[PDB]
Design a protein around this ligand. Sequence first.
Ligand SMILES: [Mg+2]
Ligand SMILES: [Mg+2]
Ligand SMILES: [Mg+2]
Ligand SMILES: [Mg+2]
Lengths: 133, 133
Amino acid sequence: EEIIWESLSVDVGSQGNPGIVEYKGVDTKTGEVLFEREPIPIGTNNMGEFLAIVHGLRYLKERNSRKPIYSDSQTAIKWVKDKKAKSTLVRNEETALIWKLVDEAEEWLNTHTYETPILKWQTDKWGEIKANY
Amino acid sequence: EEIIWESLSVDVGSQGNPGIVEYKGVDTKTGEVLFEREPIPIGTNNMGEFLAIVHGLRYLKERNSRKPIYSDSQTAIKWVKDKKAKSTLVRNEETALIWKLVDEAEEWLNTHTYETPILKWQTDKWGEIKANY
RNA sequence: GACACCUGAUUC
DNA sequence: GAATCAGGTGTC
Ligand SMILES: [Mg+2]
Ligand SMILES: [Mg+2]
Ligand SMILES: [Mg+2]
Ligand SMILES: [Mg+2]
C-alpha cells in the first residue's frame, strides 16, 4: 500500500501488438535507466513484460541486490511466478528472435535461484510505473 | 479520393482541453464563414467537433441543401452517426452550458431527418480542413 | 470482470 | 508534454 522506493521498476514499450517490442528497467526512486533492451522486430506486450522482469532478476542477482522488482503486468508476474511464459504468439521465422529470448528467460529461471520479491505496481493508486514508455 | 468541393467544412477551435471551445462552418471551396458559435466557457474538443457537425446539418436542412459535410473528427463523425455524443466531461455548474447544447444537439438529431453525407476530411492527404482555426 | 500493450483521429 | 475518444490485441 506504500511504495517501496528502494526498488527496480520495469516496463515494456511497443509499436503494435504483436509488433516491435522493447523494455527497460529504471531505479524506482530516481528513474535512472539501469538497462534497456534493443528493439525486437516481433513480439507481444506480455512477452516483453515477461522478459523485463526476468532481466531485472538477473540484473539484481549480478549485483547481489535484494531490492524488489515492480511490474504493472498481472500476466508477466504470474508467468515469472510459474517460471513459465504462456504466450500465444505464433512460432515461426518472423517471431524467432522473441521466442529465443523467451525460452532462454525460462531456462535461466530454472537454472537459478533468487528471493527477489516481484511486486505489482498499483497504477490505479500511484500513477504510471517509473519505467513507463 | 477526390475532394468534394461542393460542400461544407466544419472545425472546432479551443483554448485548453477541456477549455474554451468554439467552432465554425465555412464553404469548402471559398472558405467563406457560413456560421460561427460564440465561445463556450468549458467543453471538450470532441464536444465542440460534434456540435459543429449537428449545427452544419441544421444549417443545410434550413436551406434545402444536399451538400455533404466535412469534419476531420473521427469521434464526432461516429457520435453523429449514432446520434449519441459519448463524452466524459463532468456534468456540473461549470460545464452546464456545453452539456445543454450537446443534449439539444442529440435531441435535434432524433426529432429530424436528413440525407446529408458526413465525410471524413483526409488531413493526411489534403492538408488542414478549410474551417481550421 | 481484471491487468496491460498499442493503433488511429483530433484538441490544445 | 497533456487531454479528449474509438478500435484492436495480449492474457488471467
Ligand atoms: Mg507495463
Ligand atoms: Mg507502460
Ligand atoms: Mg477538427
Ligand atoms: Mg483544426
